[PDB]
Design a protein around this ligand. Sequence first.
Ligand SMILES: O=C(CO)CO
Ligand SMILES: O=C(CO)CO
Ligand SMILES: O=C(CO)CO
Ligand SMILES: O=C(CO)CO
Ligand SMILES: [Zn+2]
Ligand SMILES: [Zn+2]
Ligand SMILES: [Zn+2]
Ligand SMILES: [Zn+2]
Lengths: 274, 274, 274, 274
Amino acid sequence: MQNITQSWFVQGMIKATTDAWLKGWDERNGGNLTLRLDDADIAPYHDNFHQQPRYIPLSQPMPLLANTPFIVTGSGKFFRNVQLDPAANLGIVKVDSDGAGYHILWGLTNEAVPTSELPAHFLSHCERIKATNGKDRVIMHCHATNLIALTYVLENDTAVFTRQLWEGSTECLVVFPDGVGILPWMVPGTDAIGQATAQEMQKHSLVLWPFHGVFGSGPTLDETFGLIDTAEKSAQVLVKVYSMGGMKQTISREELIALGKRFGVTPLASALAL
Amino acid sequence: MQNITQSWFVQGMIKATTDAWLKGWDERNGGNLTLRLDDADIAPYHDNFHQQPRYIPLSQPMPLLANTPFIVTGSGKFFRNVQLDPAANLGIVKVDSDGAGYHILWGLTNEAVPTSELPAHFLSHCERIKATNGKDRVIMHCHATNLIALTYVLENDTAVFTRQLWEGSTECLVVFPDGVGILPWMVPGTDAIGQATAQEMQKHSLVLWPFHGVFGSGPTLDETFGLIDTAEKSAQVLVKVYSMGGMKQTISREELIALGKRFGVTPLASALAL
Amino acid sequence: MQNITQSWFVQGMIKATTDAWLKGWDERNGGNLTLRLDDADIAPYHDNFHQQPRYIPLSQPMPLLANTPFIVTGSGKFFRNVQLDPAANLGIVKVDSDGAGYHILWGLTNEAVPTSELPAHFLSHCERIKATNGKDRVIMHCHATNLIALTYVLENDTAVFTRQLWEGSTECLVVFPDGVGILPWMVPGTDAIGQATAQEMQKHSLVLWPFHGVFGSGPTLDETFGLIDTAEKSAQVLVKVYSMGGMKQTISREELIALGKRFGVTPLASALAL
Amino acid sequence: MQNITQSWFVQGMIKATTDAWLKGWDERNGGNLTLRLDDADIAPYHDNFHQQPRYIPLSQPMPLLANTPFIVTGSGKFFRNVQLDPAANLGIVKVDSDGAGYHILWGLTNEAVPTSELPAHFLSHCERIKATNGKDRVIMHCHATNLIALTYVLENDTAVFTRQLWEGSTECLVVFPDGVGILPWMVPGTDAIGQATAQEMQKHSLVLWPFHGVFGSGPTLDETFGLIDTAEKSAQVLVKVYSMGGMKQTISREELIALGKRFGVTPLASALAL
Ligand SMILES: O=C(CO)CO
Ligand SMILES: O=C(CO)CO
Ligand SMILES: O=C(CO)CO
Ligand SMILES: O=C(CO)CO
Ligand SMILES: [Zn+2]
Ligand SMILES: [Zn+2]
Ligand SMILES: [Zn+2]
Ligand SMILES: [Zn+2]
């Protein structure tokens, strides 16, 4: 088969990271992205793999991910550079049979390793697999500018934040009816923040890290990017509105309820009750 | 003739959707676009059509559109992706002889269907055909950021909104002398919102959906995109001005009247009277 | 010689208009650009000229421009499209021997004509030729967003506007020491506004049209684009500062004087006196 | 070896300047960039050098830079144009054996000379070489929009400015734990401002020029660009927050301390003490 660089998943990783770079969401090495693949996706490209894949342990056992391949962004790597050198900035890893570690089948050249937020990513994948019966396959983190700004001015509360974001663009309730979870500020790159994020992922597809950024989950790269882009678009609208003195009118509870009924989604109750 | 992908209309659809994506007006699947063609436009490309075009009924009879071909964006499709796979994200449809349904002559692969706002689009085309003696051929919907923000702060009234937009850039009165209609918030994707939009299209080339976006109509893709871009540019200026404490000076009624006289347009009376 | 489309001047016109489109300064047909050439620039491309160049009269005699060639943008044409079809959107014109009209040597296909602001352009070229002993060769008009916004909030006065723009970026006084002239609002596309603009051009390289845009003059496309980009950058900074409650500190008169002395420019006295 | 235009350093200079142009940080000739190379980097490209390299003296002796090659942007040159003509807009210079002047080995065609901020650049390189034991190799200056805006509203004090920037994005303390030095406004392009900047560079990797821009230092083009992009991203967030009425919550001192401990950096004490 064609070279792996031309595969749908490598090309998709390039598109998502490049698009996020262009959005201004990924300065420096900010942000990280992981996509769960199937063996059938990568098997045809066996000739492109490293002859002797490097092994690295996980920070904690993840048996649910045993034998599972992922394509991931690297630690310290810049989203802006992914398009310039995919193999340097991305890696395909396959988790071993006990979920204790993984082999780097392709990429992450020059002793690069996967993103330092691997705990947040892999733990969230585990919870999203459970919550969606295996449908979700992507965890994306970026420094979405307006969402970040809003964490300094809105109450850092799931119901309040969710409700404002729903109000900021009509489509929002349909795209994220489960709302947006928000953690307290925590030191990034740790097992603790990864575990805290994964817990929020049990109930929400979006999780905010105050004064830092956002994590999103979805079935495909486009749907996950689109989820974040939707929330960030609403946030952009809100920042403008708040800068102009606040809402004089907005989407009402009754309107949100009608919207949910039409699209067959049940809105997060706490956000709806406000 | 060359492949249909290289046709002026497919290329035009790619340009408009890509440009709107770059403007930040079309996150996820937000927005939709339809362009009315003539049989002579598509006839030369018969060899590129599906051998057995799929049939889909319309939600209501539209006899005015009998036998009329259109190129359209697909339901759930992303403007960002149109350039990557035109046939997946766009379709050429031809309405049948009673205006009861249409055949998908080209595109909308993998069981895709036209935009879920087809009622708003096709009903608006009908009213614009009548209002412009067949000159208007495009209906475009996008999530124009500043216009959306303004719907939370300005009175959601045709005269007031029109007047502010005219004031926000000198060219506005010349580009949309009929003004901007504004609906109450409504659940999107319905026959009701489509009908409500089409009614506003009888009197205006621009219609706002509060907390959602805008619909525009025009004779060509460029003129329709340009119409929306003009209104959105004015809105962008207004958001800046309002964020700085409001207008200390602006275009006066007398100036708007002089402008209308020079360019041979009659400004919407209600907006002028303010 | 190579085809005229590959000439430095056609390529330069494409670059400037495309760059301005990307800046968000030229929605629809907003903006226009004219560049004065020498016969030696176009003579080598005689084979690319129309066999029978169209003649169009000027609105008033301009003997100073007798026998002078220019490359210009067309009326109703979009800056966004120049790169797609240079010959459709641009034209090379040569003013006749009495300065009464011009022939369209190249471009402006399908009966297109030069920009409707030709009076403002050609009259300003005349005054800039006189004011700079023939050094200035470009007149550029665009809808620079932040400058437009500022015309609704700052006093529409040359000294005040100049002084704020100088304060908004250190380089400004060096780039436009003569300041920025500001007209009262006037109906665009007329001989009157053209004449009023040209009068301001006797004393300034930048002229603002309130609630509309800006005109700049310079020796080359890059220097003229750069002049406007500098003023617009300062305006962008100012809009942010004003939105944050205003200046707590800024560049002082004494600092501006020192800056002028170092760079060998004499700052507009009225703006300096504030 | 391949042509020097395809070298990692010429390509890197093109990427950094083009990226900064796209960010809106380098209107006109604003900004300048210098990268310290090793002889081994340029030696393979000897065939591409000027046959008779031009000599230019430095404004003051810099013996620490004796025999050192650099690639630099030119005086009056536009970042936007670097990609179009690298040899016109960039030059490779090699400082002579007493650090009294340099030869232009490549580029800076048509009598171009290095940036007029060469004193700030070369003096800062000297201090950064000392401060980082030769690890830092880049000095970058740009007109970062939000940082500039903040200099009109925040106290122009190292501790205060540093602390706000740390608060504006979690990563900031990790990326610039030494903080951001801020000079008083000074006339640019002088030995004095160069010396003042270099002094600040002894203690900080970022230095602000009020009402003007920023200087950054780092080991590579990407790390230095990323440093500035990080500070500017935080500034962008802050401008939004301040425009919305200010922080209701933010990163606390205790959180910053925990962050520093985790990442093994010691935060600038004065900024932490606030
Ligand atoms: O975004 C990150 C990459 O540095 C970490 O949270
Ligand atoms: O914009 C839309 C596409 O989801 C619908 O109004
Ligand atoms: O900008 C213009 C083009 O329509 C006119 O002033
Ligand atoms: O940015 C500069 C280039 O003009 C100088 O400080
Ligand atoms: Zn992060
Ligand atoms: Zn919509
Ligand atoms: Zn104009
Ligand atoms: Zn500078």
